[PDB]
Amino acid sequence: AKQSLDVSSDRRKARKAYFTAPSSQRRVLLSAPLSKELRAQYGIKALPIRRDDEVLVVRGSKKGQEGKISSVYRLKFAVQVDKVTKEKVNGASVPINLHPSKLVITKLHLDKDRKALIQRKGGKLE
Amino acid sequence: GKGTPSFGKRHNKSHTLCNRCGRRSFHVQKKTCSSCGYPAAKTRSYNWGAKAKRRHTTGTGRMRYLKHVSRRFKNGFQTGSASKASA
Amino acid sequence: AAQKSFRIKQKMAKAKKQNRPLPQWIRLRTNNTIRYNAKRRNWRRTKMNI
Amino acid sequence: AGVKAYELRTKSKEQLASQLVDLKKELAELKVQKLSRPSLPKIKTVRKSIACVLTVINEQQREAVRQLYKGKKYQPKDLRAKKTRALRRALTKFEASQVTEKQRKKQIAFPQRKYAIKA
Amino acid sequence: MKKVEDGNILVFQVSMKANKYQIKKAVKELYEVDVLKVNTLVRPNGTKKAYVRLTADYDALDIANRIGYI
Amino acid sequence: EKAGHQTSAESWGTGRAVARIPRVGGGGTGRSGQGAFGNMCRGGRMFAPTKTWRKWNVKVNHNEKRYATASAIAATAVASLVLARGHRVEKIPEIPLVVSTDLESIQKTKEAVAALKAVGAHSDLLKVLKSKKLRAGKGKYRNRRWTQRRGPLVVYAEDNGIVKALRNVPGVETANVASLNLLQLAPGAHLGRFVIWTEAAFTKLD
RNA sequence: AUAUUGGCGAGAGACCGAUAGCGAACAAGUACAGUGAUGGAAAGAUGAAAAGAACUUUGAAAAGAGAGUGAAAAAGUACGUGAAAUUGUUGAAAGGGAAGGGCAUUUGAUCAGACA
RNA sequence: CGUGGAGGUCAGUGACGAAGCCUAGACCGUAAGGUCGGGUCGAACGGCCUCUAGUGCAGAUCUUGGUGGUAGUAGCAAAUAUUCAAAUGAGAACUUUGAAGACUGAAGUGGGGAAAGGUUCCACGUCAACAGCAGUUGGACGUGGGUUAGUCGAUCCUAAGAGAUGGGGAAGCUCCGUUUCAAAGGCCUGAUUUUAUGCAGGCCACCAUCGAAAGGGAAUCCGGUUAAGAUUCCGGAACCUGG
RNA sequence: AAACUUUCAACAACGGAUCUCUUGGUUCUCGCAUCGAUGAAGAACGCAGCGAAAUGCGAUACGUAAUGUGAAUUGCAGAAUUCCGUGAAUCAUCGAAUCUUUGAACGCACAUUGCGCCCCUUGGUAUUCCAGGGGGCAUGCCUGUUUGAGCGUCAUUU
Ligand SMILES: [Mg+2]
Ligand SMILES: [Mg+2]
Ligand SMILES: [Mg+2]
Ligand SMILES: [Mg+2]
Ligand SMILES: [Mg+2]
Ligand SMILES: [Mg+2]
Ligand SMILES: [Mg+2]
Ligand SMILES: [Mg+2]
Ligand SMILES: [Mg+2]
Ligand SMILES: [Mg+2]
Ligand SMILES: [Mg+2]
Ligand SMILES: [Mg+2]
Ligand SMILES: [Mg+2]
Ligand SMILES: [Mg+2]
Ligand SMILES: [Mg+2]
Ligand SMILES: [Mg+2]
Ligand SMILES: [Mg+2]
Ligand SMILES: [Mg+2]
Ligand SMILES: [Mg+2]
Ligand SMILES: [Mg+2]
Ligand SMILES: [Mg+2]
Ligand SMILES: [Mg+2]
Ligand SMILES: [Mg+2]
Ligand SMILES: [Mg+2]
Ligand SMILES: [Mg+2]
Ligand SMILES: [Mg+2]
Ligand SMILES: [Mg+2]
Ligand SMILES: [Mg+2]
Ligand SMILES: [Mg+2]
Ligand SMILES: [Mg+2]
Ligand SMILES: [Mg+2]
Ligand SMILES: [Mg+2]
Ligand SMILES: [Mg+2]
Ligand SMILES: [Mg+2]
Ligand SMILES: [Mg+2]
Ligand SMILES: [Mg+2]
Ligand SMILES: [Mg+2]
Ligand SMILES: [Mg+2]
Ligand SMILES: [Mg+2]
Ligand SMILES: [Mg+2]
Ligand SMILES: [Mg+2]
Ligand SMILES: [Mg+2]
Ligand SMILES: [Mg+2]
Ligand SMILES: [Mg+2]
Ligand SMILES: [Mg+2]
Ligand SMILES: [Mg+2]
Ligand SMILES: [Mg+2]
Ligand SMILES: [Mg+2]
Ligand SMILES: [Mg+2]
Ligand SMILES: [Mg+2]
Ligand SMILES: [Mg+2]
Ligand SMILES: [Mg+2]
Ligand SMILES: [Mg+2]
Ligand SMILES: [Mg+2]
Ligand SMILES: [Mg+2]
Ligand SMILES: [Mg+2]
Ligand SMILES: [Mg+2]
Ligand SMILES: [Mg+2]
Ligand SMILES: [Mg+2]
Ligand SMILES: [Mg+2]
Ligand SMILES: [Mg+2]
Ligand SMILES: [Mg+2]
Ligand SMILES: [Mg+2]
Ligand SMILES: [Mg+2]
Ligand SMILES: [Mg+2]
Ligand SMILES: [Mg+2]
Ligand SMILES: [Mg+2]
Ligand SMILES: [Mg+2]
Ligand SMILES: [Mg+2]
Ligand SMILES: [Mg+2]
Ligand SMILES: [Mg+2]
Ligand SMILES: [Mg+2]
Ligand SMILES: [Mg+2]
Ligand SMILES: [Mg+2]
Ligand SMILES: [Mg+2]
Ligand SMILES: [Mg+2]
Ligand SMILES: [Mg+2]
Ligand SMILES: [Mg+2]
Ligand SMILES: [Mg+2]
Ligand SMILES: [Mg+2]
Ligand SMILES: [Mg+2]
Ligand SMILES: [Mg+2]
Ligand SMILES: [Mg+2]
Ligand SMILES: [Mg+2]
Ligand SMILES: [Mg+2]
Ligand SMILES: [Mg+2]
Ligand SMILES: [Mg+2]
Ligand SMILES: [Mg+2]
Ligand SMILES: [Mg+2]
Ligand SMILES: [Mg+2]
Ligand SMILES: [Mg+2]
Ligand SMILES: [Mg+2]
Ligand SMILES: [Mg+2]
Ligand SMILES: [Mg+2]
Ligand SMILES: [Mg+2]
Ligand SMILES: [Mg+2]
Ligand SMILES: [Zn+2]
DSSP: OOOOTTOOOOHHHHHHHHHTOOHHHHHHHSEEEBOHHHHHHHTOOEEEOOTTOEEEEOSSTTTTOEEEEEEEEGGGTEEEEEEEEEEOSSSOEEEEEEOGGGEEEEEOOOOHHHHHHHHHTTOOOO | OTTHHHHTTOOOOSEEOOTTTOSSOEETTTTEETTTOTTSSSOOOOTTOHHHHHTTSTTSSOOTTGGGHHHHHHTTSOOSOOOOOOO | OOSOOHHHHHHHHHHHHTOSOOOGGGGGSTTOOOOSOTTOOOTTTOOOOO | OOOOHHHHTTSOHHHHHHHHHHHHHHHHHHHHHHTTSSOOTHHHHHHHHHHHHHHHHHHHHHHHHHHTTTTSSOOOTTTSOOSOHHHHTSOOHHHHTOOOHHHHHHHHHSOOOOOOSOO | OHHHHHSOEEEEEEOTTOOHHHHHHHHHHHHTOOEEEEEEEEOTTSOEEEEEEEOTTSOHHHHHTTTTOO | OOTTOOOOOBOOOSSSSSOOSOBOOSOSSSSTTOBOSOTTSTTOOOSSOOOTTSOOSOOOOHHHHHHHHHHHHHHHHOHHHHHHTSOOOSSOSSSSEEEOGGGGGOOOHHHHHHHHHHHTTHHHHHHHHHTOEEOSSSGGGTTOOEEOOOOOEEEESSOSSHHHHHTTSTTOEEEETTSOOHHHHSGGGOSOOOEEEEHHHHHHTO
């Protein structure tokens, strides 16, 4: 259980902090785990989703599908995949919003900083 | 005649707008605001009128300056600039 | 009226500008919750006390 | 685009004054166009840019005055520390730490000793 | 627009803080033109309109579509 | 304590064909006219508003506090009682159940659970875990969201790792003999906890 | 060492649960009243996702009928459930200046149980 | 007996449908109530031993909200008055135009203003609400346009009166006094030819300030022009003040 | 026999109880000491490509500078160079600035966007008139500076 005096189990405070988190904070809540492959590859479990990453839906109705992340819709706590959409009645086409914890990362988009992050967690790269 | 035909003659203001509070409580012939007290250096208020206090205390507006005193206090009223780093 | 102080004309102006319907594009924003302009005023339904 | 301040701060005083005029001319012309076009966001960035130039100009002139007052009694009230009104008039540490002739003799002769109980 | 074609007049929205002197000179300077007189009024949305009449040497129409509008 | 009362409402007295509660005066808003202050009014003050100076704690005579905890300890032997109380102890060798002192020195949860299992707790441990349910109340949104049974109570003479190795296992509570607490000894005022005593603990008892 | 229904920052409750709890869970000290001092509300909930109903048809339109989306439109921006007063339609019944009720049985409708 | 919430327990029920709601269907209890079925619904909830209270409604001219009978009823009757036809429009007793009949009768139902309103003005679009019938019309709704000054007002002056200041009261918020028991101030130029304004004359002792869009008061007129401004714009012709 | 009235039920109305929800309220407890003439609290008016609010800001106006992060913002449009980078962002942090008209509010006034004076400077042929730019002028009181008043009063001239 909690043991520190600066942490709160209070459910009210929790939900508030969730729903009114700033964009910077939502970056980290929006984390997907790496693939079993990538996890061996980098020695490291999860990462905050960034845009051009390549990803696999492993939950829900679109389970099995894969594509390149097209936006991190931080406002909506949701991520759209460039390849996973609703076609309509009027044949207009619309992004389905997906949740990072229901994806698995399959190729990372890499920066100096991305690699820097992976190192900072004590991971390894190819 | 004391009722509505008298009300027909109601077309002169006893109060206009107050410079210090903008309230249309500045009594013209008296030259003082029935709400905020202007031009009295002090501001009108009374302990028997809590709700009115509440309606006007610090915090019911901008706080253009006080807003920031606590951050400033929190950091020891630091002066200067922040340097640099990496990543 | 008919010969006003600048202060009054000013208020008058500010109150003309505020007298417009809700801008319909707001209705489309994520989480938007404003249905219509709920502070609309009319010259013959509510006097503005200067 | 939008002009960057770390590049403004290398221009001469007189270069910035002209880039300011250049910017202002543009903004003039942009607003002329604004009321022909259905939208004109480009304007935002030209008018943030004017901010930035002024910011940097005021910055440099301040930095100049600051220094040529550095280390004298009496410098313009808006380069003095702000702090707080009370803080501003608290006794200085020198003033506070002030001790009476009679007193330091006492502090010296009999100062709080460090001691311990055991043996 | 019509005042500009028919009256050799340039209509501008102008700073509230500014008088006929300051309007006159600034039109003169920002536009390389000569001004006869400058009439002004406050719009009913709290902005100032300047009816600027150029002298007869100048041709407001020409001068307006070389600031860019039309 | 200012609630119900933030009005300057008066009665209208009688003769206006209408009840006699105070009423919000003024007009132009729907609130004016309305019943004020009364405990039967919308937005009235309540009847006998609750006060913080209500008595919340209770004083029991120290001696008699002890009669009860002593009483409560004695019942942790009596196996019928322990059985009666929830507690899955048909498997367990004898009661009182006394396990080795080597227990107090176990740093690591998984080893603590292994120990516990070996001595008969297994079935009781499983009864927590099997019993986690959403609290039926409004409790579930005042920081009491889940509900579950009580497990065994491991008593040691000296914490050399044992309280931290057990701290995270559902239902399992620890205690140092020297303290020893009625709330734990007889949960919900029903006698007969399932106690696992360390030897060291068991002899300090006397 | 003491005080603290203010201010800043925190952790909590056998507390209230939208007529309750602060007046305000919402563009609330708002909207609105009053010359003024002051007075001062109502108002939360489609769905996981707008997928917020393409298209045809009747209509001046609003809409209706189809179709379509959805786990569900018995969720359609009047939107979770959706009581009661009160209302429409359909079915059944009774009624010579009220109706309703008690004991009892006829008649009609309806139904449990036990049998093997 | 029943309800909110708390400790314990039945390893209780539940998206294969919790809770709630409906039901002249069933069953237990003398009763408070308890149980089932069926329909509806969608995410939580119950039995037992204990603990706890903001714990049970028909009334209080009870509080708030919602709803009826009354009832398609009272009514929509003051201000003399309307009519034909075309046009438009889904639609015309009510809009537009034409025609006819009347009215106000210059003590106006005309032409302007002050207070007050504040965009209602004007144009285009246009009927869901509103204009106690109607609506294609509107002071409504939507989107726009519009208020031009040396001479018109303000601004200047003083009126009743208001009100700072040296002061005097008052615990104090403040009260009194307005030239009052005050060391109360600025002009004309001379002096300068370092040099820019120090001193050399003399006067003047009037002692704040606010208070009139009807009082006092420097000066503009005619013709033309706009959807909507005009003694304000355009044309022409003047005049006042300062330099 | 209908209609009408009444009763019950089904479906549909009216209405918003009930049940479940809760970024709010209430109360307790712990830590802390920071408004303002260096112009506070409060007022007014303004500021976005497209806003009337609420929130933010101040003609540098939903922001400028700095710093950390490391790629969004999102209703639409947009930039597009901003992505192995002095670098996205309605991000966080915040040490530097800008901060209209006001307010104890300070040149005088203020139902007025009303009316002076002083300095520097620019334009108009200008020490003097007009106009533009910048900087200034409240009150009580303290220490000090300078210029002074009084047969209050000392000494000193010849
Ligand atoms: Mg930690
Ligand atoms: Mg991480
Ligand atoms: Mg999601
Ligand atoms: Mg009245
Ligand atoms: Mg009067
Ligand atoms: Mg007074
Ligand atoms: Mg004052
Ligand atoms: Mg009226
Ligand atoms: Mg930027
Ligand atoms: Mg200082
Ligand atoms: Mg021409
Ligand atoms: Mg004018
Ligand atoms: Mg009380
Ligand atoms: Mg009555
Ligand atoms: Mg209440
Ligand atoms: Mg339970
Ligand atoms: Mg419940
Ligand atoms: Mg407190
Ligand atoms: Mg605590
Ligand atoms: Mg409430
Ligand atoms: Mg209650
Ligand atoms: Mg209320
Ligand atoms: Mg809420
Ligand atoms: Mg309302
Ligand atoms: Mg609802
Ligand atoms: Mg929703
Ligand atoms: Mg349909
Ligand atoms: Mg399902
Ligand atoms: Mg359903
Ligand atoms: Mg539904
Ligand atoms: Mg729809
Ligand atoms: Mg819901
Ligand atoms: Mg519903
Ligand atoms: Mg019978
Ligand atoms: Mg009971
Ligand atoms: Mg109970
Ligand atoms: Mg309760
Ligand atoms: Mg049965
Ligand atoms: Mg069923
Ligand atoms: Mg059910
Ligand atoms: Mg649900
Ligand atoms: Mg009990
Ligand atoms: Mg009660
Ligand atoms: Mg009763
Ligand atoms: Mg009742
Ligand atoms: Mg009754
Ligand atoms: Mg009774
Ligand atoms: Mg009642
Ligand atoms: Mg009623
Ligand atoms: Mg009818
Ligand atoms: Mg009738
Ligand atoms: Mg008649
Ligand atoms: Mg009548
Ligand atoms: Mg007619
Ligand atoms: Mg006649
Ligand atoms: Mg006559
Ligand atoms: Mg008439
Ligand atoms: Mg007129
Ligand atoms: Mg009006
Ligand atoms: Mg009209
Ligand atoms: Mg209609
Ligand atoms: Mg109307
Ligand atoms: Mg009508
Ligand atoms: Mg109609
Ligand atoms: Mg309009
Ligand atoms: Mg308009
Ligand atoms: Mg005149
Ligand atoms: Mg003037
Ligand atoms: Mg006085
Ligand atoms: Mg005057
Ligand atoms: Mg006059
Ligand atoms: Mg006059
Ligand atoms: Mg004319
Ligand atoms: Mg015109
Ligand atoms: Mg006219
Ligand atoms: Mg002329
Ligand atoms: Mg001439
Ligand atoms: Mg002359
Ligand atoms: Mg027959
Ligand atoms: Mg029934
Ligand atoms: Mg039914
Ligand atoms: Mg509820
Ligand atoms: Mg929910
Ligand atoms: Mg709380
Ligand atoms: Mg604590
Ligand atoms: Mg205040
Ligand atoms: Mg915003
Ligand atoms: Mg933007
Ligand atoms: Mg950097
Ligand atoms: Mg930010
Ligand atoms: Mg500035
Ligand atoms: Mg003043
Ligand atoms: Mg001024
Ligand atoms: Mg100035
Ligand atoms: Mg002195
Ligand atoms: Mg001296
Ligand atoms: Zn005031």
